Amino acid sequence: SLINEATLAESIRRLRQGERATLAQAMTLVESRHPRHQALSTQLLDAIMPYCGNTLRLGVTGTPGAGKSTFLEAFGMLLIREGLKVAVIAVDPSNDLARAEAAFIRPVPSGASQRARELMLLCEAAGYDVVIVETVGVGQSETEVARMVDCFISLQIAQGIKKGLMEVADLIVINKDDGDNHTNVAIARHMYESALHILRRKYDEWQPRVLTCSALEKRGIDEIWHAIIDFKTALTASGRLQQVRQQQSVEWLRKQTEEEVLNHLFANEDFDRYYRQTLLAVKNNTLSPRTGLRQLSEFIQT
């Protein structure tokens, strides 16, 4: 069926009934750069807001070689066996699940952060029980994913532990606990656990947990889902999950508003030039930082 201004309400109806063709169509619309599609997309997203917010939002990162694909397939299939509908938003770095009718998989091209969030909203409005946003754990991708999900899960394989990961990890999982590397897996699991037991809790309500699994042998997956449920229980008992979700949305709005204002300034060719000359003046000991700041402020005011 066509999606357009006249049919928007019926299209939303179809979407909320969980019709997969309409979900895919709506996502494609949201991804179009055609100015007309951008305005209709805006109408759609405004319209669906009341239908969002009753979906468990999970983030999953995996380092290269961590077995993210096999884990996601096993985990996804477990959720479907539990009778749940699961969507996977596969974000680009800066199988059996594919065949499941109760699943839905969509890639997000390398911003992509706003895009991932909007696609997640569509999945929520479509009645998915669990939405998983996943990407490679590299650079700061853990903290970026963490900011849009209820529960953040990092996959690791058996330099020290990344501090940014410690900041955001709710669960750490060591995949490929199979064959002959049990000891290597146990040592890695122990190391993450030492860090997560000694550092202050991200949430007062939750000691982060470190688990192991073998996706390809189907062991440990049930236990990971159970830990996620335990997390949900702990955070919802105090009303902290709702608070987290509100804080994430406020922080996104605030950060994007600030960043647009700042990007416009630092993009300006005249300001960029004056800024760089000011920096060089300070570096070369001709101006104090105080004076550097004042003249930047005056340039901005004028």
Element (H, E) at 197: helix 182-198
Does position 248 interact with Na ion (CB under 5 A)? The reply is: yes
65 is in an annotated binding site: yes
Residues that bind its own copies in the complex, under the rule CB under 8 A: 42, 45-46, 48-50, 52-53, 114, 117-118, 121, 159-163, 166-167, 191, 194-195, 197-201, 246, 249-250, 252-253, 256-258, 260-262, 265, 275, 278-279, 282-283, 285-294, 296-297, 300
Q: CB of 72: closest distance to Cl ion in angstroms?
A: 25
Q: CB of 162: closest distance to its own copies in angstroms?
A: 6
Does position 113 interact with Na ion (CB under 5 A)? The reply is: no
The 199-238 contact track toward Cl ion, x by CB under 5 A, reads -xx----------------------------------x--
Sequence-distant contacts of 29-35: CB under 8 A, at least 24 apart: 29/3, 30/115, 30/118, 30/119, 30/122, 31/115
Sequence-distant contacts of 203-210: CB under 8 A, at least 24 apart: 203/234, 203/235, 203/240, 205/234, 205/235, 205/237, 205/238, 205/240, 206/170, 206/231, 206/234, 206/235, 208/169, 208/170, 208/171, 208/172, 209/171, 209/172, 210/171, 210/172, 210/173, 210/174
Residue 253 structure tokens:
């709005």
Distance CA 40, CA 297 (A): 40
Distance CA 148, CA 136 (A): 16
Candidate ranges 24-32, 56-64, 117-125, 242-250; the one touching Na ion (CB under 5 A): 242-250
Does position 245 interact with Na ion (CB under 5 A)? The reply is: yes
Q: CB of 119: closest distance to Na ion in angstroms?
A: 14
Q: Which of Na ion, Cl ion, its own copies, none does 245 bind, CB closer than 5 to 8 A by kind? A: Na ion
300 touches 264 (CB < 8 A)? no
Does position 241 interact with Cl ion (CB under 5 A)? The reply is: yes
64 is in an annotated binding site: yes
Distance CA 41, CA 188 (A): 45
Burial of 243 (0-12, 13-18, 19+ CB in 10 A): exposed
63 is in an annotated binding site: yes
Q: Can you tell me which of 54, 110, 159, 301 binds Cl ion, judged by CB under 5 A? A: 159
Element (H, E) at 193: helix 182-198
Q: Which of its own copies, Na ion, Cl ion, none does 242 bind, CB closer than 5 to 8 A by kind? A: Cl ion
Q: Which of Cl ion, Na ion, its own copies, none does 248 bind, CB closer than 5 to 8 A by kind? A: Na ion
Candidate ranges 38-46, 128-136, 239-247, 265-273; the one touching Na ion (CB under 5 A): 239-247
Does position 140 interact with Na ion (CB under 5 A)? The reply is: no
Task: Please state the residue numbers annotated as binding site for ATP.
Answer: 62-69
Which parts of this chain interact with Na ion (CB under 5 A)? 245, 248-249
